[model samples]
Target: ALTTTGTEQHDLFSGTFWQNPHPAYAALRAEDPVRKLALPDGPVWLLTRYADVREAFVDPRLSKDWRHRLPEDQRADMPATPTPMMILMDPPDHTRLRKLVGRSFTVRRMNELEPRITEIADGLLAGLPTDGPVDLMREYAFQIPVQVICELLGLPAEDRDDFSAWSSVLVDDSPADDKNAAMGKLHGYLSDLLERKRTEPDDALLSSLLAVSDMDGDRLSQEELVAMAMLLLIAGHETTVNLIGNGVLALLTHPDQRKLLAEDPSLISSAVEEFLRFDSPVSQAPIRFTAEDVTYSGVTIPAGEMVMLGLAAANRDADWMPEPDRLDITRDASGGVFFGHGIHFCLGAQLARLEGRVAIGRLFADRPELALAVGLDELVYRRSTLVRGLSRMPVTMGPRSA
Candidate 1:
């Protein structure tokens, strides 16, 4: 069991904590920055401050792989990945995979697809009643991302329902068996899709990946191809979904800020960065383990222990930004840790930024009088600790001018 000391006020899994965690985070930052939490596999340290978590992200003393740290009997509970997903890899392997994906997943590539992305976002908006109460998260937010990713992966529009169902299961705080079962279905579907691509190639990203495989002297194996595709499928959209959803909500909640943005469309770019830092799509760094008994900021974390870097908390650190709790569209948000730091910084940030910039700005412009239909307190966010976003966003596109 992982023993923890200090404040007993916050429970990691508590619904209230997941909804708006900053207060608890602020409490920890003021007193204990590195608190431990007990989990099924073992005790894991939670690092809260900006400097410490940022350093921990890149420090060689920490590690991404923790399979070796688990007890043999408990190892079965450890989640499995297809072909060693890059997030679960370290050093040389992480380096090679990142380089390969980087070549094809660049800002240039994302920019090239911008028109198509705009088309996707616009299409979803076209269907939302011109002026009616709609669940924006469903009507606008989720569709654009999933469609962009699906089209990129060569998936037909028909498979969207299944893709969403499977991805939801994968991200939720489901039982281990359920997640494994979800992974099994997704991998199986992807394997079949890859097999089909081999004989009938297309202009999609998945086919291009196969071309890279053939031209690079087959640098990545079949399993690696499937794994990389799955990574893009999930990472490509989930965070971006939250970005659009969260950013729009921020503007709605802060009307003055929204007015400032509505006056100048160009501010949308910086505003996207602010929203990312403000709510942060992903709540924490994936997972890390101590390579050896290491002391960080005068605290000793035993060897081979798990750790969670609070990305959201770090972004709000006063040392990192003035009025850390306030949202400012004009503030230079370029330095925020929303995309992460070091080698682990998200590869899909450019694409996500484009989506946020285009989706929210366009949606609001299409309906000048859009407003929230429900009380802010009634909004329900996702239950998982890893991801953050309202489960449903209800809003009225304010009635058409009489």
Candidate 2:
């Protein structure tokens, strides 16, 4: 048993596990591909093997929605969003909600933002100190995505600073009270912003979302609008921050791949894909509930149990990709679930890829001699349960030889 009542055991989600989980992940994939583990909320089953995780993502027996298991009267009072969060909804409703704003995220629309994205990246890079140490996670990684999201969502410049804390607290292993407080604060802000967009419409994504309707004339309610806007604002930037940060770290640590990318900047797209496969931005998929008995590795998970998919572990499974741990920039790194899989795949994926290509591609070109300021062991990762990102990536751009 991974956890026993009233006994001390290592938390599979904390401290050392968060720092570098590959070793522990490998063990689970080998010994117990489908294993049950304990969380404070309840017992959760974990899927570690690549095959199992990929299959389970599309399995109809496993559901993302948990409201069905709740008591009849309890469902209405479960801190409702205007509508259920799209990430937590099953088909039909999830389909409708996603399509309402899907046009804003189309590849054509996202591609149009590249020049502005490059401009944003270069502007931030220009302010970074070449000689002294700076936390790239803050100065560069966080700024580029945050600015892009703000501009896309029509958020004002002054209000941007507050998001750093609210977004951080919401995703971290914060207490329930702290998370709820942050949620309420962000909800309040988005609700107010939605009202402003109501009277003063603009060409930004948010205003378009507010006015958008389907063929059936189904539009989001005020509550749903606020909730969906919050999703776009938060989900838009938080994970991409890690994508840029983690991608740069991978390049700096692997000089051979770095040199290859330096020689041909066109490799930036594949390098970004490799970065996601090498060290995924999201370590685990969102918690899913089993709607019926499901068996894997000769073990059965009975109905109504929570399931956790080890996305990072699956990406590293040797069965799926050769030299899974090796940072090969040129490998065909598809089949990775870093942005998730199936119907609920990340809506911001194109935007994230665009941001990463521009930001990391420009950084390496602009600072040809960039290097980590501290030892590799000294790096600090955020103690987040789902998202994987560094809290501080201290780096120095060596004297520009270009």
Candidate 3:
């Protein structure tokens, strides 16, 4: 356990916090459920406990309205016009945007894609070299989700590489200036794509949105469509890639667990849940601004203040998981918050799980002897705090027994 300083001050963004924020988070959960931290950009409250995070998710006072919180001076520094993504809105606005996009995200629609998703996973694995080593991130992990998302969203086949590049830049933590430039470029790219979709309708999510007439008898505006597509593309690809890459890394590192999973394939379902709980890809929930003065666990959070919920910390909270640090596939999934909770839960949770299970299952089944050719410590990880993933995962296919 991390020792808390005599003072209640907790800097969630400190280097010590990033190294292993959970221990500090556990301490916060016990000592201070909600602690204020001064960030370079602004002052924010870090919500560490599971219950508190869940409550904050549904709390009306914690508004998702970015306009109200973002200062006018900062407006010029940000996107010219804030793309009203569904994730950044509350109530009727959120409801309306969600309804339009939700039609395609339904369980039925996702279920229909299972066969195609499985085929894509199988195809990617089959393409992997039977001998020598391969960087799974490039060969398999990244391609599967990116392809699936592109196909689902009806993005052109030629644009996959472009999309990947934009997504990478958008998540890179080089610096605020760099991130701002990358985001602007990404928005411009999406705007172009949206305009094309408008003129040339196809069987993609973009076309569907364009076809649907609003109650006001108008199609989704260019900005609105761009925002929707941008969110889906980023959300769909970014989270799942990390989940698949991280899950494979965990399984390979823990041979005993891997053996158990291989022997009992039925455990794959539970194993998937465990994988998510063990190392969730989205480490922290997106920033939310408090709309009004609110008190959480005896801590007063003033209105218009920034609040961040630590999903990674909350997932591993000792109070929620038994032996929270350990990866145990047999453990019950009842308490895990990998997909989040309440209204703001992940829309592509099922699709992500399916892709992960199929991708990992196929890899193990085909190349049973595949193991990390390089040392675990030598592996590179994605630097972004927003999404946890690997840049490249090298594995060698050892000789097969006759």
Candidate 4:
């Protein structure tokens, strides 16, 4: 159990929090494991320590189904919609969704796909202009996952580029006006796509899902079908883009560690885990609302308020990692909650790792002289409440290192 300082403060969506969240969070974790954040709309409960966040992941007191559980007036204070995504579901619904989507993403299934995954990585890198400065985020990292996800979903090339405008706003914390507009466009697009999938019926994950979910006739109804398709589209590629961009950026800043990995390829596995722990792609857990008055780590948060697990903070908690702030690629990251802790753990974890392992491994191996064109501090971080992502990653190449 951690003690409370009672004065810890965090800006939910500002440069103050964005610039250096690790150190600020580390200090808070030791003295105040649970802190109340002041936001414009309402109060937010942030759980910072590893133990507390881990416990919170399975705690029934803080439920994900706030729209269904909370009173009408109180539901306005919650984070998401009445139409919950699979992550926001409780027992039976979550179980059913997991059982349906689970078999397709098994580790064995991912392992079998490695040859194809590697081929995809190779093709992206092959497209990059090795002679001049390139924005890895745009040219490689962002392109890989979005392209791969479309292929998995059986979306055509003409229809693929349409997702970026909507995906960019879905995670931004700026305002709901833009969010609403993007959601409207995105929903309409997915709705149309699902209709086509139903009629044309090809071989893809979406096609397979249509076959099963439509078994009893629209148990995967129009709305649920739209939500599931959007779920795969958004959840599938967002975290992955962050992983590749952040991982490559980490290496750009740590040349020695970068050189070590460039010299030896077997270290890629540990390197990927370290990148996830050191600078997680997903910064915070989706908002989990309190079911009732609950005390966690000596702080009492009232019912119906929003509670968020600080996955990034917990992963870097000194108790979780001795020298929590340092970027050491050699450490083993077992307990870290990068993908998440329990039942709601990301289904795409295996695919993300395989993507990073293949992308980063060959990225440097192909162009050992690849170097960041801009200074590290000059780079801008996306002011997103959902995930921490780089706005741009520019790199140039010289002759191979001696």
lDDT of residue 12 for candidate 4: 41
Q: After superposition, how far is residue 288 of candidate 3 from its true place, in Å?
A: 0.4
Residue-by-residue lDDT tens digits, candidate 3, 128-149 = 7766779988888888888888
- State each candidate's clash count: 0, 0, 0, 0
- Residue-level lDDT tens digits of model 2 in 239-332: 9998999999999999999999988899999999999888988888878887778998899998778888888889999999888889998886
**Selected candidate, larger lDDT, 3 vs 4:** 4
Predicted candidate 1 versus true structure: per-residue lDDT over 1-50, tens digit per residue: 22223554654656467567777787677677887776654576888889
Candidate 2 residue pairs that clash: none
Q: After the best TM-score superposition of candidate 4, give how far the Cα of residue 228 lies from its true spot, in angstroms.
A: 1.2
TM-score to native of every candidate shown: 0.92, 0.93, 0.88, 0.92
Candidate 3 regions exceeding 4 Å error are: 1-24, 30-32, 70-81, 213-219, 399-402
Q: Candidate 1: minimum summed lDDT over ten consecutive residues — where?
A: 1-10
lDDT of 3: 0.76
After superposition on all CA atoms, how large is the RMSD of candidate 4? 3.5
Winning model by lDDT: 2
Better of 2 and 4 by TM-score: 2
Candidate 2 residue runs with Cα over 4 Å from true position: 1-11, 68-83, 213-217
Q: If the candidates were sorted by their TM-score against the true structure, best first, what order would they fall in? A: 2, 1, 4, 3
lDDT of each: 0.79, 0.82, 0.76, 0.78
